[PDB]
PDB file of N, CA and C in Angstrom:
ATOM      1  N   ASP W   5       1.031  -1.182   0.423  1.00  0.00           N
ATOM      2  CA  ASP W   5      -0.034   0.175  -0.221  1.00  0.00           C
ATOM      3  C   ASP W   5       0.963   1.178  -0.100  1.00  0.00           C
ATOM      4  N   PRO W   6       0.193   2.404  -0.349  1.00  0.00           N
ATOM      5  CA  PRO W   6       1.277   3.626  -0.649  1.00  0.00           C
ATOM      6  C   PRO W   6       1.378   4.013   0.812  1.00  0.00           C
ATOM      7  N   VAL W   7       2.452   3.368   1.058  1.00  0.00           N
ATOM      8  CA  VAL W   7       2.886   4.375   2.620  1.00  0.00           C
ATOM      9  C   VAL W   7       4.363   5.108   2.640  1.00  0.00           C
ATOM     10  N   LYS W   8       4.587   5.929   3.288  1.00  0.00           N
ATOM     11  CA  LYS W   8       6.232   6.269   3.297  1.00  0.00           C
ATOM     12  C   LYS W   8       7.262   5.207   3.958  1.00  0.00           C
ATOM     13  N   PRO W   9       7.939   5.474   2.971  1.00  0.00           N
ATOM     14  CA  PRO W   9       8.808   4.213   3.229  1.00  0.00           C
ATOM     15  C   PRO W   9      10.150   5.067   4.361  1.00  0.00           C
ATOM     16  N   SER W  10       9.749   3.651   5.252  1.00  0.00           N
ATOM     17  CA  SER W  10      10.230   3.864   6.764  1.00  0.00           C
ATOM     18  C   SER W  10       9.557   5.350   7.493  1.00  0.00           C
ATOM     19  N   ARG W  11       9.050   5.832   6.354  1.00  0.00           N
ATOM     20  CA  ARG W  11       8.521   7.554   7.229  1.00  0.00           C
ATOM     21  C   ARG W  11       9.200   8.706   6.461  1.00  0.00           C
ATOM     22  N   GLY W  12       9.963   8.199   6.209  1.00  0.00           N
ATOM     23  CA  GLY W  12      11.038   9.609   6.053  1.00  0.00           C
ATOM     24  C   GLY W  12      11.780   9.718   6.080  1.00  0.00           C
ATOM     25  N   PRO W  13      12.352  10.868   7.441  1.00  0.00           N
ATOM     26  CA  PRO W  13      13.529  10.644   8.207  1.00  0.00           C
ATOM     27  C   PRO W  13      13.956   9.883   8.823  1.00  0.00           C
ATOM     28  N   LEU W  14      14.966   8.837   8.159  1.00  0.00           N
ATOM     29  CA  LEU W  14      15.891   7.820   8.393  1.00  0.00           C
ATOM     30  C   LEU W  14      16.958   7.448   9.715  1.00  0.00           C
ATOM     31  N   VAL W  15      16.562   7.446  10.374  1.00  0.00           N
ATOM     32  CA  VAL W  15      17.296   6.936  11.851  1.00  0.00           C
ATOM     33  C   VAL W  15      17.528   5.420  11.890  1.00  0.00           C
ATOM     34  N   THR W  16      19.160   4.905  11.372  1.00  0.00           N
ATOM     35  CA  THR W  16      19.167   3.869  11.883  1.00  0.00           C
ATOM     36  C   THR W  16      19.276   3.612  13.490  1.00  0.00           C
ATOM     37  N   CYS W  17      19.011   2.152  13.742  1.00  0.00           N
ATOM     38  CA  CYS W  17      19.300   1.965  15.175  1.00  0.00           C
ATOM     39  C   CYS W  17      19.847   0.618  15.133  1.00  0.00           C
ATOM     40  N   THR W  18      20.436   0.391  16.494  1.00  0.00           N
ATOM     41  CA  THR W  18      20.728  -1.523  16.276  1.00  0.00           C
ATOM     42  C   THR W  18      19.519  -2.005  16.518  1.00  0.00           C
ATOM     43  N   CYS W  19      19.318  -2.953  15.503  1.00  0.00           N
ATOM     44  CA  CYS W  19      18.457  -3.598  15.917  1.00  0.00           C
ATOM     45  C   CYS W  19      18.329  -4.935  16.438  1.00  0.00           C
ATOM     46  N   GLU W  20      17.787  -5.070  16.987  1.00  0.00           N
ATOM     47  CA  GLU W  20      17.480  -7.098  17.679  1.00  0.00           C
ATOM     48  C   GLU W  20      15.579  -7.458  17.957  1.00  0.00           C
ATOM     49  N   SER W  21      15.596  -8.261  16.734  1.00  0.00           N
ATOM     50  CA  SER W  21      14.522  -8.824  16.718  1.00  0.00           C
ATOM     51  C   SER W  21      13.254  -8.055  17.113  1.00  0.00           C
ATOM     52  N   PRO W  22      13.250  -6.765  16.435  1.00  0.00           N
ATOM     53  CA  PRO W  22      12.238  -5.819  16.319  1.00  0.00           C
ATOM     54  C   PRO W  22      11.182  -5.406  15.359  1.00  0.00           C
ATOM     55  N   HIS W  23      11.584  -4.481  14.948  1.00  0.00           N
ATOM     56  CA  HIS W  23      11.382  -4.005  14.061  1.00  0.00           C
ATOM     57  C   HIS W  23      11.876  -4.676  12.606  1.00  0.00           C
ATOM     58  N   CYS W  24      13.019  -5.797  12.971  1.00  0.00           N
ATOM     59  CA  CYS W  24      14.271  -5.831  11.932  1.00  0.00           C
ATOM     60  C   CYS W  24      14.384  -7.251  12.352  1.00  0.00           C
ATOM     61  N   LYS W  25      14.503  -8.019  11.453  1.00  0.00           N
ATOM     62  CA  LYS W  25      15.118  -9.434  11.798  1.00  0.00           C
ATOM     63  C   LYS W  25      16.730  -9.728  11.993  1.00  0.00           C
ATOM     64  N   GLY W  26      17.263  -8.916  12.459  1.00  0.00           N
ATOM     65  CA  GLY W  26      18.421  -9.374  13.531  1.00  0.00           C
ATOM     66  C   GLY W  26      19.262  -7.987  13.186  1.00  0.00           C
ATOM     67  N   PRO W  27      19.734  -6.932  12.225  1.00  0.00           N
ATOM     68  CA  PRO W  27      20.901  -6.810  12.268  1.00  0.00           C
ATOM     69  C   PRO W  27      20.601  -4.968  12.507  1.00  0.00           C
ATOM     70  N   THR W  28      20.141  -4.306  12.204  1.00  0.00           N
ATOM     71  CA  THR W  28      20.011  -2.960  11.860  1.00  0.00           C
ATOM     72  C   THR W  28      18.892  -2.204  10.909  1.00  0.00           C
ATOM     73  N   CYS W  29      18.167  -0.762  11.254  1.00  0.00           N
ATOM     74  CA  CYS W  29      17.514  -0.271  10.531  1.00  0.00           C
ATOM     75  C   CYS W  29      17.498   1.217  10.579  1.00  0.00           C
ATOM     76  N   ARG W  30      17.420   1.678   8.992  1.00  0.00           N
ATOM     77  CA  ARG W  30      16.722   3.294   9.158  1.00  0.00           C
ATOM     78  C   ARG W  30      15.565   3.505   8.648  1.00  0.00           C
ATOM     79  N   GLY W  31      15.397   4.121   9.341  1.00  0.00           N
ATOM     80  CA  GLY W  31      13.407   4.161   9.566  1.00  0.00           C
ATOM     81  C   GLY W  31      13.057   5.413  10.339  1.00  0.00           C
ATOM     82  N   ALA W  32      12.303   5.339  11.435  1.00  0.00           N
ATOM     83  CA  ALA W  32      11.286   6.412  11.566  1.00  0.00           C
ATOM     84  C   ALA W  32      12.056   7.369  12.789  1.00  0.00           C
ATOM     85  N   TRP W  33      12.218   6.318  13.446  1.00  0.00           N
ATOM     86  CA  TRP W  33      13.418   6.577  15.002  1.00  0.00           C
ATOM     87  C   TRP W  33      13.845   5.290  15.259  1.00  0.00           C
ATOM     88  N   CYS W  34      14.594   5.709  16.410  1.00  0.00           N
ATOM     89  CA  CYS W  34      14.986   4.682  17.043  1.00  0.00           C
ATOM     90  C   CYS W  34      13.784   4.017  18.564  1.00  0.00           C
ATOM     91  N   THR W  35      13.416   3.346  18.381  1.00  0.00           N
ATOM     92  CA  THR W  35      12.441   2.655  19.295  1.00  0.00           C
ATOM     93  C   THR W  35      12.828   0.963  20.230  1.00  0.00           C
ATOM     94  N   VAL W  36      12.697   1.188  21.400  1.00  0.00           N
ATOM     95  CA  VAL W  36      13.250   0.074  21.906  1.00  0.00           C
ATOM     96  C   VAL W  36      12.148  -0.508  22.660  1.00  0.00           C
ATOM     97  N   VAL W  37      12.124  -1.806  22.935  1.00  0.00           N
ATOM     98  CA  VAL W  37      10.682  -2.133  23.720  1.00  0.00           C
ATOM     99  C   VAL W  37      11.158  -3.759  24.525  1.00  0.00           C
ATOM    100  N   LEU W  38      11.161  -3.875  25.445  1.00  0.00           N
ATOM    101  CA  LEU W  38      11.351  -4.638  26.079  1.00  0.00           C
ATOM    102  C   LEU W  38      10.140  -6.282  26.422  1.00  0.00           C
ATOM    103  N   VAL W  39      10.192  -6.874  25.944  1.00  0.00           N
ATOM    104  CA  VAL W  39       9.035  -7.843  26.680  1.00  0.00           C
ATOM    105  C   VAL W  39       9.098  -8.394  27.278  1.00  0.00           C
ATOM    106  N   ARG W  40       8.732  -7.704  28.680  1.00  0.00           N
ATOM    107  CA  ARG W  40       9.244  -7.875  30.249  1.00  0.00           C
ATOM    108  C   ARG W  40       8.622  -9.297  30.491  1.00  0.00           C
ATOM    109  N   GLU W  41       9.143  -9.876  31.134  1.00  0.00           N
ATOM    110  CA  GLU W  41       8.853 -11.473  31.683  1.00  0.00           C
ATOM    111  C   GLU W  41       8.041 -11.926  31.957  1.00  0.00           C
ATOM    112  N   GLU W  42       7.140 -11.506  33.365  1.00  0.00           N
ATOM    113  CA  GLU W  42       6.143 -12.237  34.156  1.00  0.00           C
ATOM    114  C   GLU W  42       6.052 -13.971  33.571  1.00  0.00           C
ATOM    115  N   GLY W  43       7.216 -14.691  33.990  1.00  0.00           N
ATOM    116  CA  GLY W  43       7.154 -15.972  33.860  1.00  0.00           C
ATOM    117  C   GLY W  43       8.115 -16.516  32.900  1.00  0.00           C
ATOM    118  N   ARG W  44       7.590 -15.624  31.426  1.00  0.00           N
ATOM    119  CA  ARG W  44       8.749 -15.594  30.276  1.00  0.00           C
ATOM    120  C   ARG W  44      10.226 -15.387  30.118  1.00  0.00           C
ATOM    121  N   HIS W  45      10.219 -14.153  29.782  1.00  0.00           N
ATOM    122  CA  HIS W  45      12.062 -13.017  29.689  1.00  0.00           C
ATOM    123  C   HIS W  45      11.904 -11.871  29.222  1.00  0.00           C
ATOM    124  N   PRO W  46      12.550 -11.414  29.915  1.00  0.00           N
ATOM    125  CA  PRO W  46      12.499 -10.135  29.352  1.00  0.00           C
ATOM    126  C   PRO W  46      13.950 -10.071  28.289  1.00  0.00           C
ATOM    127  N   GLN W  47      13.460  -9.941  26.577  1.00  0.00           N
ATOM    128  CA  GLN W  47      13.712  -9.698  25.470  1.00  0.00           C
ATOM    129  C   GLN W  47      13.958  -8.301  24.992  1.00  0.00           C
ATOM    130  N   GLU W  48      15.428  -7.782  25.108  1.00  0.00           N
ATOM    131  CA  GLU W  48      15.661  -6.334  24.537  1.00  0.00           C
ATOM    132  C   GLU W  48      15.329  -6.230  23.144  1.00  0.00           C
ATOM    133  N   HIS W  49      14.348  -5.636  22.238  1.00  0.00           N
ATOM    134  CA  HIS W  49      14.015  -5.915  20.974  1.00  0.00           C
ATOM    135  C   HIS W  49      14.357  -3.931  20.574  1.00  0.00           C
ATOM    136  N   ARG W  50      15.163  -3.320  19.990  1.00  0.00           N
ATOM    137  CA  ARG W  50      15.456  -2.016  19.715  1.00  0.00           C
ATOM    138  C   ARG W  50      15.632  -2.372  18.433  1.00  0.00           C
ATOM    139  N   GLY W  51      15.025  -0.701  17.781  1.00  0.00           N
ATOM    140  CA  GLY W  51      15.062  -0.568  16.297  1.00  0.00           C
ATOM    141  C   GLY W  51      14.932   0.552  15.909  1.00  0.00           C
ATOM    142  N   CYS W  52      14.854   0.381  14.169  1.00  0.00           N
ATOM    143  CA  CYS W  52      13.700   1.825  13.714  1.00  0.00           C
ATOM    144  C   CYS W  52      12.267   1.419  13.750  1.00  0.00           C
ATOM    145  N   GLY W  53      11.706   2.422  14.473  1.00  0.00           N
ATOM    146  CA  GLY W  53      10.237   2.256  14.710  1.00  0.00           C
ATOM    147  C   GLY W  53       9.340   2.229  12.905  1.00  0.00           C
ATOM    148  N   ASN W  54      10.276   2.757  11.957  1.00  0.00           N
ATOM    149  CA  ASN W  54       9.896   2.479  10.596  1.00  0.00           C
ATOM    150  C   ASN W  54       8.113   3.096  10.784  1.00  0.00           C
ATOM    151  N   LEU W  55       7.709   2.362  10.903  1.00  0.00           N
ATOM    152  CA  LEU W  55       6.306   2.683  10.757  1.00  0.00           C
ATOM    153  C   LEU W  55       5.285   2.356  11.781  1.00  0.00           C
ATOM    154  N   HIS W  56       5.794   1.619  12.828  1.00  0.00           N
ATOM    155  CA  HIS W  56       5.114   2.083  14.162  1.00  0.00           C
ATOM    156  C   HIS W  56       5.278   2.825  14.837  1.00  0.00           C
ATOM    157  N   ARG W  57       3.647   3.358  14.833  1.00  0.00           N
ATOM    158  CA  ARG W  57       4.341   5.007  16.059  1.00  0.00           C
ATOM    159  C   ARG W  57       3.318   4.128  17.261  1.00  0.00           C
ATOM    160  N   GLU W  58       3.095   2.656  17.029  1.00  0.00           N
ATOM    161  CA  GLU W  58       2.623   2.248  18.201  1.00  0.00           C
ATOM    162  C   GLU W  58       3.478   2.328  19.626  1.00  0.00           C
ATOM    163  N   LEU W  59       4.516   1.819  19.176  1.00  0.00           N
ATOM    164  CA  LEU W  59       5.904   1.810  20.017  1.00  0.00           C
ATOM    165  C   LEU W  59       6.231   2.700  20.614  1.00  0.00           C
ATOM    166  N   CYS W  60       6.018   4.158  20.372  1.00  0.00           N
ATOM    167  CA  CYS W  60       6.008   5.104  20.671  1.00  0.00           C
ATOM    168  C   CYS W  60       5.101   6.186  21.167  1.00  0.00           C
ATOM    169  N   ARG W  61       4.020   5.350  22.253  1.00  0.00           N
ATOM    170  CA  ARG W  61       2.552   5.708  22.469  1.00  0.00           C
ATOM    171  C   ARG W  61       2.362   4.934  23.384  1.00  0.00           C
ATOM    172  N   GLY W  62       2.515   3.092  23.281  1.00  0.00           N
ATOM    173  CA  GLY W  62       1.629   2.236  24.211  1.00  0.00           C
ATOM    174  C   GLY W  62       0.811   1.118  23.459  1.00  0.00           C
ATOM    175  N   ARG W  63       1.776   0.232  23.065  1.00  0.00           N
ATOM    176  CA  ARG W  63       0.428  -0.879  22.967  1.00  0.00           C
ATOM    177  C   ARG W  63      -0.395  -1.289  23.951  1.00  0.00           C
ATOM    178  N   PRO W  64      -1.297  -2.117  23.312  1.00  0.00           N
ATOM    179  CA  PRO W  64      -2.289  -3.316  24.984  1.00  0.00           C
ATOM    180  C   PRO W  64      -1.424  -3.913  25.544  1.00  0.00           C
ATOM    181  N   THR W  65      -0.251  -3.504  26.761  1.00  0.00           N
ATOM    182  CA  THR W  65       0.067  -4.382  27.122  1.00  0.00           C
ATOM    183  C   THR W  65       0.630  -3.726  28.217  1.00  0.00           C
ATOM    184  N   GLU W  66       1.125  -2.676  28.377  1.00  0.00           N
ATOM    185  CA  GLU W  66       1.138  -2.164  29.518  1.00  0.00           C
ATOM    186  C   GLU W  66       2.126  -1.826  30.508  1.00  0.00           C
ATOM    187  N   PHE W  67       3.095  -3.121  31.173  1.00  0.00           N
ATOM    188  CA  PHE W  67       3.987  -3.292  31.454  1.00  0.00           C
ATOM    189  C   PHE W  67       5.247  -3.754  30.379  1.00  0.00           C
ATOM    190  N   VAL W  68       5.440  -3.136  28.935  1.00  0.00           N
ATOM    191  CA  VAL W  68       6.312  -2.862  27.877  1.00  0.00           C
ATOM    192  C   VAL W  68       6.948  -1.676  27.266  1.00  0.00           C
ATOM    193  N   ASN W  69       8.144  -2.016  27.805  1.00  0.00           N
ATOM    194  CA  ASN W  69       8.885  -0.050  27.751  1.00  0.00           C
ATOM    195  C   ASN W  69       9.189   0.166  26.517  1.00  0.00           C
ATOM    196  N   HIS W  70       8.438   0.907  26.252  1.00  0.00           N
ATOM    197  CA  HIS W  70       7.934   1.088  24.501  1.00  0.00           C
ATOM    198  C   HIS W  70       8.845   2.550  24.665  1.00  0.00           C
ATOM    199  N   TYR W  71       9.916   2.701  24.605  1.00  0.00           N
ATOM    200  CA  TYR W  71      10.571   4.057  24.439  1.00  0.00           C
ATOM    201  C   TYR W  71      11.116   4.652  23.134  1.00  0.00           C
ATOM    202  N   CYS W  72      11.127   5.770  22.593  1.00  0.00           N
ATOM    203  CA  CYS W  72      11.619   6.343  21.285  1.00  0.00           C
ATOM    204  C   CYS W  72      12.229   7.025  21.532  1.00  0.00           C
ATOM    205  N   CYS W  73      12.928   7.199  20.316  1.00  0.00           N
ATOM    206  CA  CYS W  73      14.234   8.637  20.223  1.00  0.00           C
ATOM    207  C   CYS W  73      14.477   8.947  19.051  1.00  0.00           C
ATOM    208  N   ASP W  74      14.663   9.780  18.353  1.00  0.00           N
ATOM    209  CA  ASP W  74      14.657  10.464  16.894  1.00  0.00           C
ATOM    210  C   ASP W  74      16.366  10.873  16.957  1.00  0.00           C
ATOM    211  N   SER W  75      17.203   9.903  17.727  1.00  0.00           N
ATOM    212  CA  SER W  75      18.945  10.143  16.916  1.00  0.00           C
ATOM    213  C   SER W  75      19.224   8.829  16.441  1.00  0.00           C
ATOM    214  N   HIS W  76      19.947   8.799  15.681  1.00  0.00           N
ATOM    215  CA  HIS W  76      20.752   7.924  14.834  1.00  0.00           C
ATOM    216  C   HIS W  76      21.438   6.917  15.839  1.00  0.00           C
ATOM    217  N   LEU W  77      21.278   5.976  15.685  1.00  0.00           N
ATOM    218  CA  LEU W  77      22.168   4.807  16.599  1.00  0.00           C
ATOM    219  C   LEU W  77      21.694   5.250  18.397  1.00  0.00           C
ATOM    220  N   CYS W  78      20.343   5.360  18.500  1.00  0.00           N
ATOM    221  CA  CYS W  78      20.637   6.013  19.870  1.00  0.00           C
ATOM    222  C   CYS W  78      19.425   4.282  20.407  1.00  0.00           C
ATOM    223  N   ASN W  79      19.453   3.532  19.895  1.00  0.00           N
ATOM    224  CA  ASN W  79      19.041   2.283  20.648  1.00  0.00           C
ATOM    225  C   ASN W  79      20.179   1.430  20.428  1.00  0.00           C
ATOM    226  N   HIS W  80      21.392   2.191  20.182  1.00  0.00           N
ATOM    227  CA  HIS W  80      22.756   1.363  20.153  1.00  0.00           C
ATOM    228  C   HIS W  80      23.491   1.372  22.232  1.00  0.00           C
ATOM    229  N   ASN W  81      22.765   1.918  22.978  1.00  0.00           N
ATOM    230  CA  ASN W  81      23.365   2.199  23.840  1.00  0.00           C
ATOM    231  C   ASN W  81      21.966   2.539  24.587  1.00  0.00           C
ATOM    232  N   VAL W  82      21.125   1.900  25.371  1.00  0.00           N
ATOM    233  CA  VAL W  82      19.464   2.331  25.404  1.00  0.00           C
ATOM    234  C   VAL W  82      19.567   1.213  26.873  1.00  0.00           C
ATOM    235  N   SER W  83      18.475   1.797  27.881  1.00  0.00           N
ATOM    236  CA  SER W  83      17.730   1.020  28.938  1.00  0.00           C
ATOM    237  C   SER W  83      16.735   0.489  28.541  1.00  0.00           C
ATOM    238  N   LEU W  84      17.114  -1.008  28.552  1.00  0.00           N
ATOM    239  CA  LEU W  84      15.292  -1.543  28.368  1.00  0.00           C
ATOM    240  C   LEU W  84      15.120  -2.590  29.640  1.00  0.00           C
ATOM    241  N   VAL W  85      14.733  -2.154  30.890  1.00  0.00           N
ATOM    242  CA  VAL W  85      15.037  -2.676  32.496  1.00  0.00           C
ATOM    243  C   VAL W  85      14.030  -1.789  32.561  1.00  0.00           C
ATOM    244  N   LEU W  86      12.806  -1.180  32.326  1.00  0.00           N
ATOM    245  CA  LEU W  86      11.215  -0.744  32.765  1.00  0.00           C
ATOM    246  C   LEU W  86      10.813  -1.659  33.751  1.00  0.00           C
ATOM    247  N   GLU W  87      11.458  -1.711  35.274  1.00  0.00           N
ATOM    248  CA  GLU W  87      10.829  -2.030  36.329  1.00  0.00           C
ATOM    249  C   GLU W  87      11.278  -1.649  37.800  1.00  0.00           C
ATOM    250  N   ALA W  88      12.686  -1.364  37.480  1.00  0.00           N
ATOM    251  CA  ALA W  88      13.359  -0.462  38.519  1.00  0.00           C
ATOM    252  C   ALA W  88      15.135  -0.233  38.087  1.00  0.00           C
ATOM    253  N   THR W  89      15.225   1.055  38.821  1.00  0.00           N
ATOM    254  CA  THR W  89      16.550   1.085  38.685  1.00  0.00           C
ATOM    255  C   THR W  89      17.972   0.180  38.762  1.00  0.00           C
ATOM    256  N   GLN W  90      17.529  -0.980  37.176  1.00  0.00           N
ATOM    257  CA  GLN W  90      18.690  -1.842  37.434  1.00  0.00           C
ATOM    258  C   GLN W  90      20.349  -0.819  37.152  1.00  0.00           C
ATOM    259  N   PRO W  91      21.153  -1.715  35.984  1.00  0.00           N
ATOM    260  CA  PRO W  91      22.322  -1.096  35.833  1.00  0.00           C
ATOM    261  C   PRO W  91      22.172  -1.540  34.385  1.00  0.00           C
ATOM    262  N   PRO W  92      21.447  -0.284  33.308  1.00  0.00           N
ATOM    263  CA  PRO W  92      21.775  -0.251  32.522  1.00  0.00           C
ATOM    264  C   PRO W  92      23.219   0.436  31.583  1.00  0.00           C
ATOM    265  N   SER W  93      23.226   0.951  30.416  1.00  0.00           N
ATOM    266  CA  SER W  93      24.042   0.871  29.478  1.00  0.00           C
ATOM    267  C   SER W  93      24.149   2.732  29.894  1.00  0.00           C
ATOM    268  N   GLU W  94      23.497   3.225  28.897  1.00  0.00           N
ATOM    269  CA  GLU W  94      22.970   4.355  29.218  1.00  0.00           C
ATOM    270  C   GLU W  94      21.197   5.039  29.280  1.00  0.00           C
ATOM    271  N   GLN W  95      21.214   5.257  31.025  1.00  0.00           N
ATOM    272  CA  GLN W  95      20.046   5.360  31.607  1.00  0.00           C
ATOM    273  C   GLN W  95      19.388   6.921  31.282  1.00  0.00           C
ATOM    274  N   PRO W  96      18.481   7.124  30.778  1.00  0.00           N
ATOM    275  CA  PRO W  96      17.918   8.143  30.411  1.00  0.00           C
ATOM    276  C   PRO W  96      16.948   8.737  30.611  1.00  0.00           C
ATOM    277  N   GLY W  97      16.781   8.032  32.414  1.00  0.00           N
ATOM    278  CA  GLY W  97      15.829   8.345  32.909  1.00  0.00           C
ATOM    279  C   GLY W  97      15.425   7.235  34.347  1.00  0.00           C
ATOM    280  N   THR W  98      14.993   7.503  35.451  1.00  0.00           N
ATOM    281  CA  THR W  98      14.241   6.788  36.202  1.00  0.00           C
ATOM    282  C   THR W  98      14.020   5.545  36.027  1.00  0.00           C
ATOM    283  N   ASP W  99      14.202   4.202  35.534  1.00  0.00           N
ATOM    284  CA  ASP W  99      13.293   2.911  35.264  1.00  0.00           C
ATOM    285  C   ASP W  99      12.688   2.968  35.804  1.00  0.00           C
ATOM    286  N   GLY W 100      10.821   3.111  35.942  1.00  0.00           N
ATOM    287  CA  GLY W 100      10.278   2.405  37.149  1.00  0.00           C
ATOM    288  C   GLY W 100       8.959   1.981  36.206  1.00  0.00           C
ATOM    289  N   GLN W 101       8.293   1.257  36.381  1.00  0.00           N
ATOM    290  CA  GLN W 101       7.316   0.324  35.819  1.00  0.00           C
ATOM    291  C   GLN W 101       6.289   0.956  36.553  1.00  0.00           C
TER     292      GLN W 101
END
């Protein structure tokens, strides 16, 4: 369907199983999203939001850390531990669920 290719302003971000199937992506911006454990396991999926603005506003999940930043390689060193102030790499704010 006629959709803006990666929305337009291409921000590349380290991708890890989120919007990309392995490596990296040029997209809309950098969006990180941890699939919080609750029995399962916290998987830190980061990369280009591309066309998904949902990951920068909140999906029907609540306890999912959907962080978005308009800077290249922002998900390269991001905090995905929305739960408590654990020790991440670059903590841009007090991680709290």
